[PDB]
Write a protein that binds this ligand. Structure first.
Ligand SMILES: Nc1ncnc2c1ncn2[C@@H]1O[C@@H]2COP(=O)(O)O[C@H]2[C@H]1O
Length: 201
DNA sequence: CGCCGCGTCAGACTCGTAGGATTATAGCATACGTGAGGTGGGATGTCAAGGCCTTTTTTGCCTAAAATGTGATCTAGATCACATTTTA
């Protein structure tokens, strides 16, 4: 199928890595759909410290809060993880798309459900567990991804101490120190950016 | 029977236009009723304060009882210039 009917009518566009997709503060007039690739959600503060909120791969909806409320502003940042490709259409078409067949917003409603529940796990994990707790649990989390690479003893993923520091919200170097604590306890290996995780599977 | 005289009876249809009448007629007195006017007066209608009950607004109050304060003792986060070191 039915998505064929949907993207048969959409306006199609490509864009490179690290381009700014959505600007925090611009008007609510366009929905977007990741056709190919992955993308990352972050936010910004008075200080300018960046805080990665989420990250999503192919098969997800982007630009969903402003669809209903006339003239909302963009409540976060979203920047390209890699060079990736998207289809887009504005809101006046989507009333034609919900009034004719409401299945699209069922799909949106499900992915938005998983979204808000992992946001509940997010705010709880941020709330109560110590630094080791939520860094460990989020490590377990991105071990899940399709982006994660296979390893005969588990998995392996490429990431810097900075960006993981931006999902837990602490300094890159203290993440270095707890990474050393987890190497001392014989649970994770790492060289530079390439971390290798045991315990999976 | 068959005139002749007299009399009776119809004379198309829808619209428009104007305002409109006239003569002369006695006079005064009696006496009675009805119309336009007063007039107190039941009686109705109004407007401002008081006694029955319930509801509402303050307001007692009743005890569970969870909350709001006391402050010295810590803790697990958080930094910054130098020394590399990794990755597209
Ligand atoms: N809690 C969140 N989780 C994931 N993405 C978010 C969140 N908040 C905002 N965004 C993203 O930021 C975008 C800002 O504009 P939209 O609300 O149209 O769509 C939003 C999402 O793509």
């Amino acid at each position: 199928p039915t998505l064929e009917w949907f993207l048969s009518h959409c306006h199609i566009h490509k864009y490179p890595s690290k381009s700014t997709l959505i600007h925090q503060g611009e008007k609510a007039e366009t929905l977007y759909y990741i056709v190919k690739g992955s993308v990352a959600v972050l936010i910004k503060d008075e200080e300018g410290k960046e805080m990665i909120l989420s990250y999503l791969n192919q098969g997800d909806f982007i630009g969903e809060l402003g669809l209903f409320e006339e003239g909302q502003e963009r409540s976060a940042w979203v920047r390209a993880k890699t060079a990736c490709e998207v289809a887009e259409i504005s809101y006046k078409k989507f009333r034609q798309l919900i009034q004719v067949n409401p299945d699209i917003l069922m799909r949106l409603s499900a992915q938005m459900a998983r979204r808000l529940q992992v946001t509940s796990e997010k705010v709880g994990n941020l709330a109560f567990l110590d630094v080791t707790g939520r860094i460990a649990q989020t490590l377990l989390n991105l071990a899940k991804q399709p982006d994660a690479m296979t390893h005969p003893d588990g998995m392996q993923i490429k990431i810097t101490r900075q960006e993981i520091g931006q999902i837990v919200g602490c300094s890159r170097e203290t993440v270095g120190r707890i990474l050393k604590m987890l190497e001392d306890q014989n649970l994770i290996s790492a060289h530079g950016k390439t971390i290798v995780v045991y315990g999976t599977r």
